[PDB]
Amino acid sequence: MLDAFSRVVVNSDAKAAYVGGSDLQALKSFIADGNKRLDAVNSIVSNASCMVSDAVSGMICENPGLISPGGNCYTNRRMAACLRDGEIILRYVSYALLAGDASVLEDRCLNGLKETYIALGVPTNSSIRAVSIMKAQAVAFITNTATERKMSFAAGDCTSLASEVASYFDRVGAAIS
Amino acid sequence: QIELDAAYTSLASSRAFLAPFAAMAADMDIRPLYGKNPQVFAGQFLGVGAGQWGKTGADTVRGRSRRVAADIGVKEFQLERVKQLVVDLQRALALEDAEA
Amino acid sequence: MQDAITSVINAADVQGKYLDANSVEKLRGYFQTGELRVRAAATIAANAATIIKEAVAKSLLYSDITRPGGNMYTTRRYAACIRDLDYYLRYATYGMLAGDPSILDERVLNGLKETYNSLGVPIGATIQAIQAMKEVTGSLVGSDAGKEMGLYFDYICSGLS
Amino acid sequence: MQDAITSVINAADVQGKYLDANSVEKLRGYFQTGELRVRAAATIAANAATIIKEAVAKSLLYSDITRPGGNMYTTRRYAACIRDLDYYLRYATYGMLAGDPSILDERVLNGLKETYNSLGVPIGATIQAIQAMKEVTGSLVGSDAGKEMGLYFDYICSGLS
Amino acid sequence: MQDAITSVINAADVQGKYLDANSVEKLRGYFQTGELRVRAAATIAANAATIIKEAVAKSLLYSDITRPGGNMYTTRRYAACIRDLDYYLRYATYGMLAGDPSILDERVLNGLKETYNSLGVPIGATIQAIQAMKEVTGSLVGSDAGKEMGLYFDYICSGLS
Amino acid sequence: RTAYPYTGSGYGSAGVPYGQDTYGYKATTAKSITETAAQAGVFNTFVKLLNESGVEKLVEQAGPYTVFAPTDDAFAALLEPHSFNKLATLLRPENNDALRKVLMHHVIPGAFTSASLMDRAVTVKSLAGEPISIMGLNKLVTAGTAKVVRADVPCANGCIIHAVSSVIIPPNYVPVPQPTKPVFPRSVIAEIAKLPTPRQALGLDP
Amino acid sequence: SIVTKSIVNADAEARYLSPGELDRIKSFVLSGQRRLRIAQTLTENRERIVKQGGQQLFQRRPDVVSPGGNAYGEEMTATCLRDLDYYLRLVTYGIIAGDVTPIEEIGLVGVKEMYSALGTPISGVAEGIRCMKDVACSLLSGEDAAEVGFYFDYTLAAMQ
Amino acid sequence: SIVTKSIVNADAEARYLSPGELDRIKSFVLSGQRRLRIAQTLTENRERIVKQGGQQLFQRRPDVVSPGGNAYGEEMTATCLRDLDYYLRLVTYGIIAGDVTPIEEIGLVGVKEMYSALGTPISGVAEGIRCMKDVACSLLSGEDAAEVGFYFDYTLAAMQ
Amino acid sequence: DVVNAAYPKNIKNKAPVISFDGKKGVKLEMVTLQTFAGDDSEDTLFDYSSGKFMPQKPADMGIAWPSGDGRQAEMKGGKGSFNQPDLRKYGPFPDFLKRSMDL
Amino acid sequence: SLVTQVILSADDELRYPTAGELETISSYLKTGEYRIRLISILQGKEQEIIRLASKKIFQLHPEYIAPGGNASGARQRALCLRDYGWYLRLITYAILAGDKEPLEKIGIIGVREMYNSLGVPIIGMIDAIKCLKEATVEVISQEEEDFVAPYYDYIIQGMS
Amino acid sequence: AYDMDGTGAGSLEPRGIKSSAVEKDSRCFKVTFVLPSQSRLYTFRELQNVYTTKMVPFSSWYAEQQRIQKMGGKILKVELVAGGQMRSVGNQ
Ligand SMILES: C=CC1=C(C)[C@@H](Cc2[nH]c(/C=C3N=C(/C=C4\NC(=O)[C@H](C)[C@H]4CC)C(C)=C\3CCC(=O)O)c(CCC(=O)O)c2C)NC1=O
Ligand SMILES: C=CC1=C(C)[C@@H](Cc2[nH]c(/C=C3N=C(/C=C4\NC(=O)[C@H](C)[C@H]4CC)C(C)=C\3CCC(=O)O)c(CCC(=O)O)c2C)NC1=O
Ligand SMILES: C=CC1=C(C)[C@@H](Cc2[nH]c(/C=C3N=C(/C=C4\NC(=O)[C@H](C)[C@H]4CC)C(C)=C\3CCC(=O)O)c(CCC(=O)O)c2C)NC1=O
Ligand SMILES: C=CC1=C(C)[C@@H](Cc2[nH]c(/C=C3N=C(/C=C4\NC(=O)[C@H](C)[C@H]4CC)C(C)=C\3CCC(=O)O)c(CCC(=O)O)c2C)NC1=O
Ligand SMILES: CCC1=C(C)/C(=C/C2=NC(=C\c3[nH]c(/C=C4\NC(=O)[C@H](C)[C@H]4CC)c(C)c3CCC(=O)O)/C(CCC(=O)O)=C2C)NC1=O
Ligand SMILES: CCC1=C(C)/C(=C/C2=NC(=C\c3[nH]c(/C=C4\NC(=O)[C@H](C)[C@H]4CC)c(C)c3CCC(=O)O)/C(CCC(=O)O)=C2C)NC1=O
Ligand SMILES: CCC1=C(C)/C(=C/C2=NC(=C\c3[nH]c(/C=C4\NC(=O)[C@H](C)[C@H]4CC)c(C)c3CCC(=O)O)/C(CCC(=O)O)=C2C)NC1=O
Ligand SMILES: CCC1=C(C)/C(=C/C2=NC(=C\c3[nH]c(/C=C4\NC(=O)[C@H](C)[C@H]4CC)c(C)c3CCC(=O)O)/C(CCC(=O)O)=C2C)NC1=O
Ligand SMILES: CCC1=C(C)/C(=C/C2=NC(=C\c3[nH]c(/C=C4\NC(=O)[C@H](C)[C@H]4CC)c(C)c3CCC(=O)O)/C(CCC(=O)O)=C2C)NC1=O
């Protein structure tokens, strides 16, 4: 797996180059807001036990045939797995927000999830809505516009980390579509 | 209407475009050269001259707000033609009814 | 670039016949009025600037393609319009005299809609402007002459669509 | 052909609004780096021939495109390269000063990859040459200035790919 | 634009090797026919107008492309033909001397079939005119010289098809 | 004799004409955006929604765009129980307003081919106005929630067309509410009784 | 701006930028702090610069507002001041761009075709911009008034 | 005239004059008797055609004669009518030449440069010629008024 | 054809729809019960178009222009008096490439 | 035709047709049917006239008819009357559209290289048209043959 | 400078091609067209290919496109290869 430091290494290995003065301004700006990124992961993992119940139960009130018998959230063992992959996906997105690159997202979480969900018979369009409520929550927590819990922050712009975590959930929602 | 309603939102956007200047020229001193008092030669301006009043009078008076606003005669004419045809074409089917 | 006489001749001898009596009814329509078209082209030459000023004010100048962001915002872009509308009112005058719309697609229509898409010129507002310009042209030249000049305006609007 | 100030003015003008705090916030960010870009463009003008001589000798000097049959064999073909590499190092200098890569695709990128395929010029060796040319450019202008000049090199390499 | 010697030198140069026995073997084969090609190009220069007059009268003189509506009716259109057929008989003479048909597609074939489709020129009647023109050219220059001059006529007919 | 031969004539030539076909500057043969899609026979709802919604004038333009036109199976896949909540309201004939942005989120300024996305994650905002993250890794190029199906389609003005599997909804897009009833308060004394008096705000009264 | 046409100048000549071109891009960006202050003065003085701009315009050209004038009535007079708000905005662009390039391709190229085609006296709108210039230069010091007035009179020159 | 530009047309084309050109020089010279009668009517009606021409011009454009107008006072108003006497004279030339070639290179070529450089509203002088046209066509029959008016409106077209 | 004079204005009344409402009487009804109709016909009784109308273009004449090189589109009259026949014939030709008879 | 020459000739100057040109269209259209009445007279005499043309073109030039000449043989002489038929058909076009373009866009432009590649002596074809004009005078009265006379000798001028 | 100084009808320089190109414009098209000469049969000059595809600038596309139809040409395809759309500043 890679991070934002070693993504530009294996890009600079593709051009047999040293990591010179052109590419280090991309990375010294990355550690310039390194305090901003850790203030963005901390908003995700502090509500991460509550966001997964917020997002799976939002999928149920939209598509209530899952908890209908013969569905895919009917059996109580089968419900407890759907709370688990709401937060394993949130574990691997929060690693991708931490590392700054979506390699660990695209080599461990999405590595075979598409043929998993076919072979378990999981409805894929409801797995999009389980993922995308966590996209609309994490861009509310990182911009601190969640409508019932505000966290304390040193003030300033944060909209690049909001679109970065929205880019990691679309990497998930396209790979399992 | 739902393209007549898009015409009303363009009239509301055209007035907000000019409202910083419409109210900024409302307390200027705009004095003309003729046309108001009869001691000055205005020529045909005395009123308007020889056919130039128009079919209506508003076609007749420029402005951004009016000119897209007399547009409304043309999109509301096509809606009223196909509606009010709904009055009396709900009549042959309305009163054809009691008959069969 | 053929007029009514050129098209009558010209079809006429592409097979090579002589003009028979059936097809001198185009000619006999066209050569009757011939009187109507010149007076129609007379007043249009006089009120060229007045007609274009009436069409844009009745038409897209109230829109908002006129405001910032719209397709007609900058003065170079606004000035290109009345330059552009002048050709439609001018070439339509040529079609009205020649009695044949061959000059329009020869010199106006070809590569026109393909050009406005390149520049990003709104074809919808363009046709409306020509339709409004057709409406004022029927004011000047009269009813039947407006029917003649109007017959080439929508030819431009049809092909430009 | 827009610089950073032209692009900021365009986006602020295209909505018809004035230059608010966000538009001037980026403009102040461009004026801060105005001192860095000129000195970067200063040394690149001085060592133009030296940079291109370093890139070709470091990337594609002895590869078999240089030998007979390779894409660069004849002296006309070799001379076209350093002429060709001069534009990449030159236009990248313009993007570094203007702070906006609009000039590259306007004057370099469009019809470029479609042209090399016509001539049969290897796009793979071309990008490597620009990558090596980007590597030496970071030597002269420093780290952050190399980051700026390097930011437009890979823009050429990306679109040329 | 390469002759037989230019093409032999190019292929021997493009591998960076000298003119070995195989490269000179073809060059000796070209010099042997050097005497035949000049006399072939000699008589064709003399009977240029006579050959074209013979081809059109033998292939497409009285067909209904010649009659009204056909693609050769008007005198401008007829005069364009013998102007057009002159290039085929002329450029084929150049290929016969140079011993390489590179000049044809360089200066005749490219954009040719794409041009006749624009004008609406019938490619079918064009090739038969060149075929008939090839038939009379074998009359003048003889059999083997006609085989040489004929070898470039059908090259035009093939690519023009 | 080298395989990658070249173009040109005269000496120093490989026996191949200039440009591989004697044309240096080749006239293009592609159509524009919306009728390259019209010929494909798969973007039928996409070209029709463009024509109705007026967005099709925007992607007529010559600017280098990267359209992510969804095949109509994507539009046919809009019958999610989930996605039907936020998108069914657009079926109403007055809500052309949101239909243009939601369609304008699929146009990307620039020509991003899939080969240009070799393990690269770059974002951009649409012509709708909000950022979208194009992410190409492991030969799986993504555009929001796209999961692109067909790689690229070369178009007229150097534009590219990618076929996506779903419809990308913009990030800060809220669905339009259904048409409702303008409700008015019955009474007026049930509302004076609903407002706290100043003597209540100080705790002087219950 | 000075940056974009100093480039396209040296672009056409097949060369890089001389010291004469690069010591002025350098000299312009150090001037950038002072330019934003000048444009910041005209930005939130448009209420007075425009309204007092049309003040002297009507006192000097009562024909255009009198009955028969192009800007007659409540309607046209509002648009009569709208154009002055436009041209006052473009001068703020020219001050920050350090050139009339923004004013060139907006409000100057083909301006006579528009105003002739609108029936507006182009000399009258030139009088309006001159009245705005005296109000604008009265809001700034002498060192600044040689700039803010400097862009108006270019607009005066091209507008006749 | 029709004779001189039907020549210079066929002159440029390296050819003689066609029947289409020579059946119109023929048709024009037989028209010459009727042309001199028409120009003879406007020749000694310049007192009324000009003075009534400036009649409607001031009633329709009082700005140009009001204080501040270009033709203000006893002086400019005399020159205000002088130009109408010029353009009425050129129309008499165009009627006898059978073309606006005399009116073209006199009073039309570069006319906007003169009147813009004199401060005169070019639209105002166009209004003056239209007022003369109604007086001129009121002096002739319908067959003639389709000619005498025909040359005025060409002058109206080129004068804007 | 309108051959239903057997079927009057009282066709689709559907007399036997019967609702018992329990053990009491059958409450007979003659509700008409229309279909999932739609009455598929074009060019109905009015225009329903208020403006926004310039849709008309001529048909494609091939390579030529539109409004054809005339000859492939209707003459009738005199052929002439002498008129030697063709004897080659080389195919009938299409939209004549741009230049009419009067080029 | 004549209107086409006015639309073209006015189009390269980017202007509407002037006063003189609109005469040239108006006078041409008022003489409309008389060309239409005239061409029907000539179409009924095409078998009339070409029989008379073969009278004197061959008694003047027996070189072409004799064995060895181009027109020797039946089928060579068969089209010989056809070329008269096309020329006479072209003149009916030229008499109608009152100018020379149907005689020039067809027939005249490049006629020598057509005949020179055919073997027809180009001087003989000049006498053939001169013979054809000599033949048209007999079946036509004095009123209308000088109307059609200038259309013939243009062909002779075109062929030299 | 630019082609829209105030020139129109009745102005001293002759009425001609007026393009909406800004100061030193940098937009250019990629056009394709055939243009038969229609004058070689009385001039007898050498022949040149009439099917061309070339980059014309925005400053002079309109004059060229207005002229290509003057001599009966047909325009097969044109595009705006270099330059933006709806761009207020930056065409220079
Ligand atoms: C490292 C990667 C990784 C993941 C992403 C998760 C996801 C995941 N879930 C399940 C297993 C399951 N996953 C689901 C999930 C769902 N069904 C729905 O309708 C919802 C849309 C969704 C919950 C949000 C269900 C219902 C099962 C139970 C199947 C069963 O027990 O038979 C399995 C198979 C495991 C097994 O049962 O043996 C996996 C791999 N776990 C992982 O290890
Ligand atoms: C039918 C059932 C149903 C629900 C249960 C809710 C569930 C829900 N909440 C949000 C939207 C959200 N959901 C949360 C989640 C939470 N808020 C918190 O503070 C906690 C951390 C956590 C609950 C424990 C947050 C933070 C947002 C963003 C806005 C905000 O609430 O401040 C969204 C996405 C936006 C939307 O589609 O409306 C959904 C579906 N909505 C429904 O339609
Ligand atoms: C945004 C997406 C969207 C929808 C989901 C529908 C939802 C919807 N349906 C109706 C309104 C209605 N909906 C029904 C439908 C039904 N009633 C029944 O008893 C049946 C069980 C069921 C049909 C199968 C009926 C009968 C009406 C009354 C109006 C009508 O019949 O046209 C209304 C108007 C509300 C009102 O005025 O009362 C709305 C918003 N419309 C939308 O725009
Ligand atoms: C008010 C409206 C009304 C009705 C809907 C019927 C309903 C009905 N049927 C029967 C009573 C009956 N109904 C049936 C009929 C049947 N039984 C079967 O097993 C067959 C499947 C079916 C024949 C079709 C029979 C066989 C009897 C019993 C004999 C009889 O009473 O005729 C009874 C009397 C039951 C009892 O004694 O409690 C009633 C109320 N009668 C009414 O008055
Ligand atoms: C040197 C390589 C080369 C060629 C070959 C060439 C061809 C060429 N042929 C042309 C026309 C033409 N070519 C023909 C030819 C024919 N009609 C027929 O029926 C026959 C099948 C055929 C004669 C063999 C005609 C009739 C035209 C005129 C078309 C028109 O006026 O529309 C034209 C248009 C312009 C002009 O003639 O001035 C070009 C450019 N140009 C070149 O550079
Ligand atoms: C940014 C450069 C720029 C300018 C300058 C511009 C001008 C402009 N002026 C207009 C109208 C107008 N302008 C005037 C102006 C005046 N009347 C007077 O008496 C004065 C002399 C003068 C103002 C000082 C009037 C009266 C109208 C309305 C004319 C009408 O309604 O017919 C209109 C049409 C309505 C509109 O869309 O606003 C435009 C587009 N557009 C631009 O993009
Ligand atoms: C034959 C073609 C031709 C024309 C037309 C012409 C015009 C002409 N008009 C002039 C002045 C003038 N022209 C006017 C005209 C007008 N004031 C108005 O209000 C009206 C709108 C308009 C008249 C209807 C005025 C006021 C002056 C004097 C301007 C001054 O003194 O500054 C002058 C300068 C003084 C002189 O030498 O007469 C010339 C040369 N010369 C020519 O050779
Ligand atoms: C519309 C204008 C037009 C013309 C005129 C035309 C002429 C023409 N004349 C031809 C032949 C010929 N034309 C003649 C003509 C003559 N012998 C004489 O003594 C006479 C003076 C003269 C006839 C009046 C002869 C003898 C031939 C045959 C030559 C040969 O093939 O051996 C041919 C070859 C095919 C054919 O006969 O149809 C053409 C195309 N094509 C055109 O498109
Ligand atoms: C004779 C046949 C013919 C036509 C019609 C023609 C059109 C044409 N219109 C153009 C531009 C233009 N056309 C417009 C027109 C409009 N904007 C709107 O909002 C309206 C809908 C519309 C006015 C009706 C504008 C604004 C431009 C400038 C575009 C730009 O600067 O990007 C250009 C670019 C070059 C230039 O104007 O100098 C051409 C070539 N050329 C021709 O040869």
What is the atom index within ligand 1 of the atom nearest the CA of A124?
Answer: 21
Q: Which of F164, F24, F22 is nearest to F103 (CA)?
A: F164
Range of the domain at A85: 1-177
Give the closest ligand to the alpha carbon of residue H75: 7
SS3 I57: coil
Contact of K89 with chain D, judged by CB distance below 8 Å, is answered with: yes
Closest chain E CA to residue I94: E120
Residue nearest to atom 5 of ligand 7 (CA): H83
Element (H, E) at K78: strand K74-82
Closest-CA residue of G relative to B66 is G75
Distance F93 CA to ligand 3 centre (A): 15
Measure the CA dihedral G5/G8/G10/G12, to 10°: -140
CATH of the domain at A151: 1.10.490.20
Residue among J128, J124, J107, J138 at smallest CA distance from J54:
J128
Cα–Cα distances in angstroms (integers) from residue E135 to residues E138, E143, F127, G131, K76, in the given order: 5, 11, 64, 86, 37
Please provide the DSSP assignment of F144-175 as one string.
Answer: SS---SEEEEE-TTS-EEEEBSS-PPPTT--P
J72 contact partners, CB below 8 Å, separation of at least 6: J64, J65, J66
Report yes or no: K77 and F28 within 8 Å, Cβ to Cβ: yes
Q: Which two tokens stand for residue D120?
A: 């049969």
Q: From CA C21, how far away is CA I45, in angstroms rounded?
A: 41
Facing residue for K85 by CB, picked from C110, C114, C119: C119
Tokens of residue J147, six digits = 């109307």
Ligand found nearest the CA of J66: 8
**Angle, in degrees to the nearest 10, between helices C75-98 and J2-11:** 170
The beta-carbon neighbor of K85 closest among C107, C110, C120 is C120
Q: Which two tokens stand for residue E42?
A: 């000699």
Q: Which amino acid is at H123?
A: S
**Are H157 and C46 a contacting pair at CB < 8 A?**
yes
Q: Which of E7, E105, E106 has its CB closest to that of F15?
A: E7
Atom of ligand 7 nearest to the CA of H90: 1
Q: In this structure, how many other beta carbons lie within 10 angstroms of the beta carbon of residue J28?
A: 25
In this structure, how many other beta carbons lie within 10 angstroms of the beta carbon of residue I70?
26
Nearest to residue C150, comparing CAs of C140, C135, C161, C160?
A: C135
* Region class of J66: left (phi > 0), else alpha (psi between -120 and 50), else beta: beta
Picking from E155, E150, E156, the residue whose alpha carbon sits closest to that of residue E87 is: E156
Q: Where are the alpha helices (DSSP H) in chain A?
A: 4-12, 24-28, 34-45, 48-60, 76-99, 113-119, 124-142, 159-175
Q: How far apart are CA F40 and CA E90, in angstroms?
A: 46
Q: What is the largest CA-CA distance in chain A?
A: 61
Any residues with CB less than 8 A from the CB of D70 and at least 6 apart, and which?
Answer: D63, D64, F2, F4
Whether D146 sits inside 8 A of A22 (CB atoms) is: yes
Question: Which residues partner with K80 through β-bridges?
Answer: K29
Contacting partners of chain F (3+ CB pairs under 8 A): A, B, C, D, E, K
Total domains in the fold of chain A: 1
What whole-number distance in Å separates Cα of residue D26 and Cα of residue J128? 85
d(CA G50, CA G58): 12
Rounded CA separation A63/F147 (Å): 23
Other Cβ atoms closer than 10 A to F1:
10
Distance J17 CA to ligand 7 centre (A): 28
Pocket mutation for ligand 7, best pick of H50, H72, H82, H83 (most atoms within 8 Å of C-beta):
H83
- List % helix, strand, coil for chain C (3-state, nearest 5): 75, 0, 25
Read off the tokens for J70.
Answer: 């181009």
How far does CA F198 lie from the centroid of its chain? 54
Mutation choice for ligand 6 from B17, B33, B64, B65, CB with most ligand atoms inside 8 A: B64
Contact at CB, K87 and D10, closer than 8 angstroms: yes
d(C-alpha H121, C-alpha G124), whole Å? 11
Task: Let me know how many helices (H) and strands (E) chain J has, helices first.
Answer: 10, 0
Q: What angle do CA E72, E78, E82 make, to 5 degrees?
A: 120
User: Which residues does chain G have within 8 Å of residue H125's beta carbon, measured at their own beta carbons?
Assistant: none
Contact C111 K65 (CB under 8 A): yes
Atom 43, ligand 6: residue with shortest CA distance? C74
Cα separation, D8 vs D2, whole angstroms = 9
Q: Are A23 and A12 in contact (CB under 8 A)?
A: yes
Q: Which residues contact F172 (CB under 8 A, 6 or more apart)?
A: F130
The resolution of the experimental structure, rounded to one decimal in Å, is: 3.3
Pairing of strands K51-57, K74-82: unpaired
Burial (Cβ within 10 Å: 0-12, 13-18, ≥19) of residue A6: middle
Which of F159, H70, D160 shows the shortest CA–CA distance to K80? F159
Chain K residues lying within 8 Å of J110, measured CB to CB: 41-42
* C74 neighbourhood in chain G, CB within 8 Å: 105-107, 109
First to last CA, chain E: 22
Q: Could you give the CA distance from residue F68 to residue F66 in angstroms, rounded to a whole number? A: 7
Decide: J and G in contact? Rule: 3+ Cβ pairs under 8 Å.
no
Token pair belonging to J36: 């239409």
DSSP state of K32: E
Of A106, A120, A119, A128, nearest in space to A176 by CA:
A128
- How close does chain F come to E157, measured CA to CA in Å? 17
Residue type, K39: S
Q: At what angle do helices H19-30 and H32-43 cross, to 10 degrees?
A: 50
Q: Which residues line ligand 5 (CB under 6 A)?
A: E 65, 71-72, 76-77, 80-81, 84-85, 87, 107-108, 112, 115, 119, 121-122, 125-126, 129; I 97-99, 103; K 36-37, 40, 47, 49-50
Name residues 4-63 of chain K within 8 A of C (Cβ): 4, 18, 20, 22, 29
Two tokens at B19?
């409202």
Q: Residue with the nearest Cα to atom 31 of ligand 1? A: A78
Asked if D60 contacts D72 with a C-beta cutoff of 8 angstroms, the reply is: yes
What is the DSSP code (8-state) at residue F179?
A: P
Residue F175 near residue F84 (C-beta atoms within 8 A): no
In three-state secondary structure terms, G59 is helix
F119 and A11 in contact by Cβ < 8 A? yes
User: Do H19 and J99 lie within an 8 Å CB cutoff?
Assistant: yes
Q: Which residue type, as a one-letter code, is found at position C38?
A: V
**Tokens describing residue G37:** 């202050």
Say which DSSP state J75 is in.
Answer: H
**Which of F178, F180, F181, F183 for a ligand 3 pocket mutation test, highest count of atoms within 8 Å of Cβ?**
F178
- J37 marked as part of a ligand binding site: no
I near H: at least 3 beta-carbon pairs less than 8 Å apart? no
Q: Is D119 on the interface with F (CB under 8 A)?
A: yes
CA separation for the pair A143, A150 (Å, rounded): 10
Alpha-carbon distance D100 to D97, whole Å?
Answer: 8
Q: Name every residue whose Cβ is closer than 8 Å to that of residue F40 and which is 6 or more positions away in sequence.
A: F153
Residue from A46, A17, A28 nearest A144 by CA: A46
Residues belonging to chain I: 103
Q: How many residues does chain K have?
A: 92
Contacting B with CB below 8 Å, chain F residues are 93-94, 96
Q: How far is A175 from chain F (nearest CA, A)?
A: 6
Question: CB-based contact (8 Å) between D92 and chain A?
Answer: no
The CA-CA-CA angle for residues B3, B8, B14, to 5°, reads 125
Question: What are A15's two structure tokens?
Answer: 């051009």
E157 has binding-site annotation: no
* Rounded-to-integer distance, Cα G86 and Cα B21, Å: 10
Determine the distance in angstroms separating the CA of D98 from the nearest CA of chain G, rounded to an integer. Answer: 7
Residues 6+ apart with CB under 8 A from A1: A99, A103, A104, A107, A108
Establish how many alpha carbons lie within 13 A of residue F48's alpha carbon, considering only the half-sphere containing its beta carbon.
8
Residues D40, D45, D50: CA angle, nearest 5 degrees: 105
- Ligand 3 site, CB within 6 A: F 88-89, 92, 178-179
- Per-residue tokens: C100: 């044949």
d(CA F202, CA G49): 50
Neighbours of I21 (CB within 10 A): 8
Cα–Cα distances in angstroms (integers) from residue G129 to residues B23, G1, G135, H63, in the given order:
19, 22, 10, 22
- Tokens encoding I71: 């000859």
CA nearest neighbour of D136 among D79, D60, D58, D62: D58
Instruction: Identify the residue whose tokens are 């891009």.
Output: G25
Tokens of A80: 């407890």
Could you tell me the strand order of the sheet in which F131-137 lies? Answer: F120-125, F131-137, F140-143
Q: How far apart are CA F7 and CA D85, in angstroms?
A: 20
Q: Which residues contact residue G8 at a Cβ distance below 8 angstroms, ignoring those fewer than 6 apart? A: D1, K24, K26, K92
Place of tokens 């004026």: D31
Q: What gap in Å lies between CA J99 and CA J5, rounded to an integer? A: 9
Distance CA B45, CA H61 (A): 8
Q: Other CB atoms closer than 10 Å to residue F89's CB: what's the count?
A: 15
Separation between Cα atoms, residue E6 and residue F12, nearest integer Å: 9
Q: Yes or no: say if F63 and F127 are a contact pair by the CB < 8 Å rule.
A: no
Angle between helices G122-137 and G46-60 (to 10 degrees): 130
| One-letter amino acid for residue F161 of the chain | I
Long-range residue pairs from F45-53, CB within 8 A, at least 24 positions apart, any chain:
F45/F72, F45/F75, F46/F70, F46/F71, F46/F72, F46/F75, F49/F99, F49/F103, F50/F103, F52/F96, F53/F96, F53/F99, F53/F100, F53/F103
- At residue E2, what is the residue type? Q
CA distance J1 to chain C (A): 6
Burial code (b: 16+ CB inside 10 Å, e: under 16) for F126-151 equals bbbeebbbbbbbeebbbbbbbbbeee
| Burial of C20: CB neighbours in 10 Å, binned 0-12, 13-18, 19+ | middle
| A54 CA to centre of ligand 2 in angstroms | 6
C-alpha distances out from residue C89 to A113, C96, F33, F50, J24, Å: 64, 10, 31, 31, 22
Mutation site, D9, D13, D17, interface C, largest C CB count within 10 A = D13
For residue C1, give the chain K residue with the closest CA. K72
